[PDB]
Design an enzyme around this catalytic site. Structure first.
Site, short mmCIF file in Angstrom:
data_model
loop_
_atom_site.label_atom_id
_atom_site.label_comp_id
_atom_site.label_asym_id
_atom_site.label_seq_id
_atom_site.Cartn_x
_atom_site.Cartn_y
_atom_site.Cartn_z
N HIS A 40 -6.32 -10.65 32.65
CA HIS A 40 -5.59 -11.59 33.15
C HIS A 40 -5.67 -12.60 32.24
O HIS A 40 -4.82 -13.90 32.38
CB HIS A 40 -5.72 -11.70 34.50
CG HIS A 40 -6.94 -12.77 34.91
ND1 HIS A 40 -7.91 -12.35 35.53
CD2 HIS A 40 -6.89 -14.06 35.10
CE1 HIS A 40 -8.77 -13.42 35.61
NE2 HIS A 40 -8.06 -14.61 35.40
N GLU A 52 -21.17 -22.07 21.75
CA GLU A 52 -20.82 -23.63 22.46
C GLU A 52 -21.69 -23.82 23.54
O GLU A 52 -22.13 -23.13 24.22
CB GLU A 52 -19.25 -23.16 23.12
CG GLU A 52 -18.39 -23.12 22.07
CD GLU A 52 -17.89 -24.50 21.63
OE1 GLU A 52 -18.67 -25.69 21.83
OE2 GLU A 52 -16.51 -24.65 20.98
N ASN A 54 -21.39 -27.82 24.81
CA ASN A 54 -20.28 -28.59 25.34
C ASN A 54 -18.91 -28.31 24.50
O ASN A 54 -18.72 -28.45 23.36
CB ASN A 54 -20.42 -30.24 24.79
CG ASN A 54 -19.69 -31.24 25.70
OD1 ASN A 54 -18.46 -31.11 25.37
ND2 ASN A 54 -20.12 -32.31 26.07
N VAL A 57 -17.23 -31.18 22.19
CA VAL A 57 -17.97 -31.94 21.33
C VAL A 57 -18.42 -30.89 20.21
O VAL A 57 -19.10 -30.04 20.72
CB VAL A 57 -19.44 -32.66 21.66
CG1 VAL A 57 -20.01 -33.33 20.51
CG2 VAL A 57 -18.67 -33.56 22.60
N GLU A 62 -21.75 -23.87 16.50
CA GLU A 62 -20.51 -23.20 16.92
C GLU A 62 -20.12 -22.32 15.95
O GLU A 62 -20.38 -22.54 14.60
CB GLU A 62 -19.27 -24.14 17.39
CG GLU A 62 -19.51 -24.88 18.41
CD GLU A 62 -20.01 -26.47 18.15
OE1 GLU A 62 -20.72 -26.69 16.94
OE2 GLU A 62 -19.97 -27.19 18.92
N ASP A 84 -8.92 -5.16 35.43
CA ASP A 84 -8.84 -6.46 34.67
C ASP A 84 -9.95 -6.51 33.42
O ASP A 84 -10.86 -7.10 33.69
CB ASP A 84 -9.31 -7.42 35.71
CG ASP A 84 -8.67 -8.74 35.28
OD1 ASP A 84 -8.09 -9.12 34.13
OD2 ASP A 84 -9.07 -9.88 35.91
N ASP A 171 -20.12 -20.15 43.75
CA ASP A 171 -19.18 -19.02 43.25
C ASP A 171 -18.61 -19.31 41.88
O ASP A 171 -18.86 -20.55 41.32
CB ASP A 171 -17.70 -19.04 44.18
CG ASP A 171 -17.09 -17.86 44.05
OD1 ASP A 171 -17.25 -16.75 43.31
OD2 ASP A 171 -15.91 -18.10 44.80
N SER A 172 -18.02 -18.33 41.14
CA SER A 172 -17.30 -18.62 40.01
C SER A 172 -15.78 -19.11 40.48
O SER A 172 -15.37 -19.41 41.67
CB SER A 172 -17.10 -17.63 39.13
OG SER A 172 -16.65 -16.49 39.69
N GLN A 174 -11.82 -21.09 38.81
CA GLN A 174 -10.91 -20.92 37.65
C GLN A 174 -11.24 -21.52 36.35
O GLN A 174 -11.76 -22.44 36.60
CB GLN A 174 -9.46 -22.05 38.40
CG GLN A 174 -8.53 -21.56 38.95
CD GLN A 174 -8.73 -20.73 40.26
OE1 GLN A 174 -9.56 -21.47 41.34
NE2 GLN A 174 -8.32 -19.67 40.41
N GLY A 175 -10.89 -20.90 35.31
CA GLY A 175 -11.57 -21.36 33.90
C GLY A 175 -12.73 -20.60 33.68
O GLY A 175 -13.13 -20.62 32.58
N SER A 177 -12.70 -17.29 34.15
CA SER A 177 -12.43 -15.80 34.39
C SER A 177 -12.57 -15.41 32.91
O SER A 177 -12.36 -15.99 32.03
CB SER A 177 -10.65 -15.93 34.47
OG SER A 177 -10.51 -16.10 35.78
N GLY A 178 -12.70 -14.11 32.88
CA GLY A 178 -13.12 -13.56 31.80
C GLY A 178 -14.45 -13.35 31.54
O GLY A 178 -15.01 -12.65 30.38
CA CA Z 1 -19.24 -27.53 20.97
#
Ligand code: CA
Length: 223
Positions: A40, A52, A54, A57, A62, A84, A171-172, A174-175, A177-178
């Protein structure tokens, strides 16, 4: 992640952020070339961000690598979220190091009651909205199949499990996901769905990765 903690920079070195001009989902690095995420979370135009902490920034560890291919499961059903799961191939291999590392796929399915690590840059409020910049973490136990089915009657398949706290508060969201659910050092779940976040009697529902290991292995052997 609601009710979690700040992980600590690069302490979850397999966590990735999927970016299409902005962070929109998590994923898990399973080898130098491949990420596991939720179907999804499919978008065209994905850049994988590894290393990553932050996400707003550039801190120096990264690796930003475009996806070359995304492969949604052949039986994904976006209405029920059954199956999913998605694979994303990187255009170039990541350089693996102490801050960018793969997570093992499971051999066996995890056990009810096992405490797992769930992580992401998703919303931290059950009521309202606040997205963190740094990675958040949560330890949550796998719930029994019977409890999970009681929480979401007629909606839980054999390819899903619940994890979390039926009293609410953790909980987890929105955002997230995955992103990963790691139990005994292996990727056992993908953040998939739930009714709201951290609400009483509505735990998180997660893709059961142990059911997909033969698909993952044959797909990466072939792409
Ligand atoms: Ca960063």
């Amino acid at each position: 992640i609601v009710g979690g903690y700040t992980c600590g920079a690069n302490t979850v070195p397999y966590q990735v952020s999927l970016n299409s001009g902005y962070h929109f989902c998590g994923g898990s690095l399973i080898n130098s070339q491949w990420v596991v995420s939720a179907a999804h979370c499919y978008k065209s135009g994905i850049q994988v961000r590894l290393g990553e902490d932050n996400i707003n920034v550039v801190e120096g560890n990264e690796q930003f690598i475009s996806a070359s291919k995304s492969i949604v499961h052949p039986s994904y059903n976006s209405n029920t979220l059954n199956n999913d799961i998605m694979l994303i191939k990187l255009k170039s291999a990541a350089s693996l190091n102490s801050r960018v590392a793969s997570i093992s796929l499971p051999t066996s399915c995890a056990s009810a009651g096992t405490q797992c690590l769930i992580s992401g840059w998703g919303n931290t409020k059950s009521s309202g909205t606040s997205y963190p910049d740094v990675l958040k973490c949560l330890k949550a136990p796998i719930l029994s199949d019977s409890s999970c089915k009681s929480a979401y009657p007629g909606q839980i398949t054999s390819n899903m499990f619940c994890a979390g706290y039926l009293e609410g508060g953790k909980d987890s969201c929105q955002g997230d996901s995955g992103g990963p659910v790691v139990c005994s050092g292996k990727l056992q779940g993908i953040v998939s769905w739930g009714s709201g976040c951290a609400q009483k009697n509505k735990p998180g529902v997660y893709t059961k990765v142990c059911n997909y290991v033969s698909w993952i292995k044959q797909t990466i052997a072939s792409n």
